[PDB]
Symmetry: C3
Subunit: 206 residues, 3 copies
């Protein structure tokens, strides 16, 4: 129905994003390229539709989006935590909480009843412990990254609760469109805005 158009739009946008990020940025470790490329793979699988599950109020759930975030958001968390000049051990810790948040989030979306509630509570506890050291960072770059944590990262659990993954108050297509806007904001706009600042900060403490 309309959902294939949402997924097809995500494949095209992140294919353009991955192509730009590779050519425009330095030919070395390119997190921006890897994040968009992983997202392309995730949208193709969601478009194939073999991994769709029943959601709330007659909606559907694509829990593999949450599993692919664990790989792509750990790369984002690496850039974010390094931008705030967290210690190496704190970076490793935050990247683990991110994998935990997405992993339990996919389980919360796929399962039902008290298991959806329990996995959501666990994922939100790990999320609270993930963003607390970032929102209270003494770094001067803290305000520059709070816009992406508060608007983008925290928009997903809210979308989750409204989507068929949670209470199913919005339909599956509306959730996919809102997920896509959140993806563009946290994966593409995030680099258009902060790449050079992150690049300069990284050539000074490495």
């Amino acid at each position: 129905n309309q959902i294939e158009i949402v997924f097809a739009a995500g494949i095209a946008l992140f294919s353009v994003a991955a192509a730009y990020f590779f050519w425009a940025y330095k030919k070395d470790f390119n997190s921006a390229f890897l994040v968009s490329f992983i997202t392309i793979i995730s949208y193709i699988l969601m478009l194939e539709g073999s991994l769709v599950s029943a959601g709330a109020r007659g909606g559907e759930v694509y829990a593999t989006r949450w599993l692919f975030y664990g790989l792509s958001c750990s790369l984002l968390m690496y850039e974010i935590a390094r931008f705030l000049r967290k210690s190496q051990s704190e970076i490793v810790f935050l990247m683990f909480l991110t994998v935990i948040v997405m992993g339990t989030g996919g389980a919360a979306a796929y399962f039902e009843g008290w298991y959806k509630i329990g996995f959501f509570v666990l994922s939100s506890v790990a999320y609270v412990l993930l963003v607390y050291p970032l929102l209270t960072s003494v770094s001067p770059n803290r305000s520059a990254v709070a816009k992406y944590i508060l608007l983008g990262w925290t928009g997903f659990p809210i979308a989750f609760l409204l989507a068929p993954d949670g209470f199913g108050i919005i339909t599956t297509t509306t959730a996919a469109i809102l997920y896509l806007l959140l993806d563009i904001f946290t994966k593409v706009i995030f680099y258009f805005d902060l790449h050079r600042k992150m690049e300069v900060n990284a050539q000074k403490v490495l």
Copy 2:
């Protein structure tokens, strides 16, 4: 039947353990918190029961316990190997053997016939090569960690063979109770006993 009570007990204990370890320990990389948190996730999945398989002598197998160990026991092996002051390259090697041991162990538990035997032999070869450099460590902390390798880590393959994962000589609930006691010993008591020693050793070679 009685097994849900065993899994519910594990969820409550490791939720208390994860809560204590986070608040009591330093607000940086907390392996003790991550190990217990991962174990909570594993026990909820086992309690949901969608990933249960037929075992030996009419028992059942929860092979995802073994897959989740590959993530949580690699964190334990990191602390153990660093405590014995293994080289960084030896630490990376041991963490790989741990993932191999748990991964092949989950396959041994899930499959039957000569494949259970073959996967068990492979997992035990990798296990022998994993613990040999630890039991013969020249570190003075070697005796302090041998109690957990011999009593706790080596108790799992013995429990495996008795459980429905192996010959099914004990029932599924008895195996779950014995697994839970082994979990508490190797994941919780391990830190009550060795945290400060490991913390002091780590602030001296890092």
Copy 3:
């Protein structure tokens, strides 16, 4: 039929290879041992046959071979990239492209229609970006590794297209035999030829 003999041959050869590599090489991080050991696990699963899927022209596909390559070829890429003295950040980048190439390759093999084509194109783009920095390396070891990239690594996508994973022009058993020869060349002969050179190069920039 004949395919079990191909898989049984792979189990025996890599069991001999893993046994030799462990005993002959230094008792520290042994990539050669880990690569062969992982390959043993992969061939046993393929021999068990629960993860076989329908292929092209009545052939079959064992897509888990491609998923296990993502773990074992990242170890090979680590040795290759370190041998060419790539920077640490470039090594991490190449190991990610390898996981992407194998991951999308398993999806290309498992799915059909435009999804097989799309996943193949994505996997080949990531493959082109993976081998370009290696084939144009200014390292003097570049020619010593180009034989394995061109003959061995690039033989897999060609075999893929001929195998039931692609167009199904060759049968499943012929593909398995050709996969096995490629495995022996890139995983075993690769170390018989380059171990000491790689060992000496590694004791000079570490």
